[PDB]
């Protein structure tokens, strides 16, 4: 009956909790107590990109570490050349309510989506000389939160109907759907070798999914409300999350536990975005208090602040070679720090 | 720019033309009036959009129309079953809110209390501290027919007025206005929807004008 199944789930939860606790002899801090501190991180602003006329909601770096794309609520996608602050393309959208954007790893296509429950794929290289819509992918029943290219023919999306999906851009049909969350999925992150990915949702839990067969492998809890951002460590064996309780967290795949908590007593606002450095030593996080903090990821110390925006910082990214950091904000500006 | 090459100058000229087109498009799109349409399930939103769709030009639904050389756009988000707290901050900065309530629900499952809860949630929000609300009370005739048999006291235990339209409608209107807690900043406009054509859109037009004028006067006096 139902009651025996609830008791069975309680016994399985107790078994998981005891098996996790039985292999936690030492802390990450005790191990990294003898490391020298990083010191002080002082980053200046090198470029300022202007031309948006409303709030900026997403951005993504190109894989050549020079070009990038930005999305805003005035109904434009803009492609920027960060070295000279020139505009390469400007794409008008059919819907002004856009919440995410992505850049293909090859450079040929660009993806977009928002409150219209549709993911749009745009072709950047054509004989006619203008950017045109290549495909529209429909089938989600809630707003689209994030999207990431795996290839020129495969894309992974997450939505506020508590599901994720994997698409086939040639055909336009879902090949696999990932279910199990009980809240709106808000963020998503691909592994470096592109065989697994993580998803963070509004039930205050994160899940590890396997791309080849749509099954969940591990579930990580510990937050208190509404994980908003997630990212992989460069090694591919750990990840970090950021939520509304003004706290970042570091989770480890192989030990299936929690390693460190990045919280301060003077910070009481939520976190919008999170990212790592190139070597995985610094953790950068954006907040609602118009700032951006830089944390020593191994000693859990505050190392720096980026304080050049006038409204909420909504998006944040680091280049592939690790030469610069880009931040976007609701005051309609993008800045490059180095 | 004296060290640039021949191709760099043409790239800069292309970027300047892109800037010009962006500025002209923003100047053109800054002359719109944006309204957010809300309600509690089946209230009569379809009737309002049908009887205001004077001209013609799931996800989200759009409607563009003109009335006395003034353009309006009305967004409807009744198909979003996800969490409202995660996408409502996209709609701050709209000109006004159109809230639709049906008067025939005072004895149905009441269902009026759900409308009261939604109005209290949206009127005292942290993003709509200054956005004006236009309130439509649809289904007047069916309320007239139903009140003659089912007394209003089934909805309000504290009611003590007469069982007739003129008193009960004013009592409902006051039990909906008396939920604002910022009577110094915003305002509530009430209109009992009538089947006669043009009247409803006229009321919207008058309200949006007298809201724009008070905004221009409130702000430009800052110094």
């Amino acid at each position, epitope marked *: 009956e139902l009651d025996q199944l609830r008791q069975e789930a309680e016994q399985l939860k107790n078994q998981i909790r005891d098996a996790r606790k039985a292999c936690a002899d030492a802390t990450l801090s005790q191990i990294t107590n003898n490391i020298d501190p990083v010191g002080r991180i002082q980053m200046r602003t090198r470029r300022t990109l202007r031309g948006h006329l409303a709030k900026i909601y997403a951005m993504h770096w190109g894989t050549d570490s*020079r*070009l990038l794309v930005s999305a805003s609520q005035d109904g434009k996608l803009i492609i920027w*050349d960060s070295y000279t602050t*020139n505009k*390469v393309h400007a794409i008008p959208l059919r819907s002004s309510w856009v919440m995410t954007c992505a850049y293909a790893p090859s450079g040929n296509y660009v993806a977009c989506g928002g409150l219209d429950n549709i993911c749009s794929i745009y072709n950047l290289k054509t*004989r*006619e*000389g*203008n950017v045109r819509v290549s495909r529209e992918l429909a089938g989600h029943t809630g707003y689209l939160s994030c999207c990431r290219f795996l290839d020129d023919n495969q894309i992974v999306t997450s939505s506020g109907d508590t599901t994720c999906a994997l698409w086939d851009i040639e055909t336009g049909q879902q090949t696999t759907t990932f279910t199990g969350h009980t809240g709106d999925v808000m963020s998503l992150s691909l592994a470096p070798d592109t065989r697994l990915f993580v998803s963070g949702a509004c039930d205050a839990s994160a899940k590890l999914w396997d791309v080849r067969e749509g099954m969940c492998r591990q579930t990580f809890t510990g937050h208190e409300s509404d994980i908003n951002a997630i990212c992989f460590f460069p090694n591919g064996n750990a990840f970090a999350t950021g939520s509304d309780d003004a706290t970042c967290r570091l989770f480890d795949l192989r030990a299936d536990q929690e390693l460190m908590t990045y919280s301060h007593d003077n910070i009481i606002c939520g976190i919008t975005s999170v990212s790592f450095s190139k070597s995985g030593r610094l953790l950068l996080a954006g907040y609602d208090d118009f700032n951006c903090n830089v944390w020593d990821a191994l000693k859990a110390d505050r190392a720096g602040v980026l304080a050049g925006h006038d409204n909420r910082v909504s998006c944040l990214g680091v280049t592939d070679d690790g030469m610069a950091v880009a931040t976007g904000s609701w005051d309609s500006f993008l800045k490059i720090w180095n | 720019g004296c*060290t640039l*090459s*021949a*191709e*760099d100058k*043409a*790239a800069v*000229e*292309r970027s300047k*033309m892109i800037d010009r087109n962006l500025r002209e498009d923003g100047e053109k799109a800054a002359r719109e009036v944006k309204l957010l349409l809300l309600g509690a399930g089946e209230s009569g939103k379809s009737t309002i959009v049908k009887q205001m769709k004077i001209i013609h030009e799931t996800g989200i639904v759009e409607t563009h129309f003109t009335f006395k050389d003034l353009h309006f756009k009305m967004f409807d988000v009744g198909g979003q079953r996800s969490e409202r707290k995660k996408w409502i901050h996209c709609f701050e900065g709209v000109t006004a809110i159109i809230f639709c309530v049906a008067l025939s629900d005072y004895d149905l499952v009441n269902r009026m209390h759900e409308s009261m809860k939604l109005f209290d949630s949206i009127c005292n929000n942290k993003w709509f501290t200054d956005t004006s609300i236009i309130l439509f009370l649809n289904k007047k005739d069916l309320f007239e027919e139903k009140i003659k048999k089912s007394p209003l006291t089934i909805c309000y235990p504290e009611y003590a007025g007469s069982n007739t339209y003129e008193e009960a409608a004013a009592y409902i209107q006051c039990q909906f206005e008396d939920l604002n807690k910022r009577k110094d900043t915003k305002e509530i406009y009430t209109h009992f929807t009538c089947a006669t054509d043009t009247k409803n859109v006229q009321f919207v037009f008058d309200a949006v004008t007298d809201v724009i004028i008070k905004n221009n006067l409130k702000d430009c006096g800052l110094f």
Partner: single-chain antibody, 233 residues
Framework: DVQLVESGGGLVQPGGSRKLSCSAS????????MHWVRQAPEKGLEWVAY????????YYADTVKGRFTISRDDPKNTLFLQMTSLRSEDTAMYYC??????????????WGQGTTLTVSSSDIVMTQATSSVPVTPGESVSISCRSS???????????LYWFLQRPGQSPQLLIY???NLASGVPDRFSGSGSGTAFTLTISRLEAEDVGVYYC?????????FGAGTKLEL
């Protein structure tokens, strides 16, 4: 498909005037810059005139200043050249070329068809060895083109372009900026070289690769071509 068709050529009494037109169809005309390039009856190519996108920049060759005028009409998708005081040295064949400039683009990618005009009775120098070398199908060949002034800019780019003209046709882009392979070109063509010394390498030479090869520089106006080297069986 992409098309550029020219008209307005014929026999002209010297000292007269004429107008040439170039009608495009198949692409976004208003986003491209346009060039007029002419070819003498038995010699190589020479750049003539250039009009920008948005008509904000116009350049002319050193020999047609004060005589020729270039213009465009965007709604009808037309490019015009007005020619006055026609000297007998203007007898040539005129081509209409499109080019677009942004980070990563490929200028000079589509060439027109050509119209024939028969008038009755500080520059960078690019050098090539014009002797028609013999080839056989299967082997590999190299082509050289040395400049007088270094084509390497300070931003890392080297502005050299390679074109191929098969017998009785219009030129075709092969290599742009000394290394990049054009779209639709088989991977048998390679381009390399340092400043003031460049090489084009063809491996596994087929039977459709006979013709004339030209090298061009795009470092600064006026644009200058080479004399052109011929491959024949």
């Amino acid at each position: 498909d992409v098309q550029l068709v020219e008209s307005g050529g014929g026999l002209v009494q010297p000292g007269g005037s004429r107008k040439l037109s170039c009608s495009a169809s198949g692409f976004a005309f208003s986003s491209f810059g346009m060039h007029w390039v002419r070819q003498a009856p038995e010699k190589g190519l020479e750049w003539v005139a250039y009009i920008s996108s948005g008509s904000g920049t116009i350049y002319y060759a050193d020999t047609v200043k004060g005589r020729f005028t270039i213009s465009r009409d965007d709604p009808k998708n037309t490019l015009f050249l007005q020619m006055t005081s026609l000297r007998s040295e203007d007898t040539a064949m005129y081509y209409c070329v499109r080019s677009i400039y942004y980070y990563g683009s490929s200028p000079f990618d589509f060439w027109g068809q050509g119209t024939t005009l028969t008038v009755s009775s500080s520059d960078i120098v690019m050098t090539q060895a014009t002797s028609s070398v013999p080839v056989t199908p299967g082997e590999s060949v190299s082509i050289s083109c040395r400049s007088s002034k270094s084509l390497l800019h300070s931003n890392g780019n080297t502005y050299l372009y390679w074109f191929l003209q098969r017998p009785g046709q219009s030129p075709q882009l092969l290599i742009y900026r000394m290394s990049n392979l054009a779209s639709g070109v088989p991977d048998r063509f390679s381009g390399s070289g340092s400043g003031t010394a460049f090489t084009l390498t063809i491996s596994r030479l087929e039977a459709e690769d006979v013709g004339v090869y030209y090298c061009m520089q795009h470092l600064e106006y006026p644009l200058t071509f080479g004399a052109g080297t011929k491959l024949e069986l």
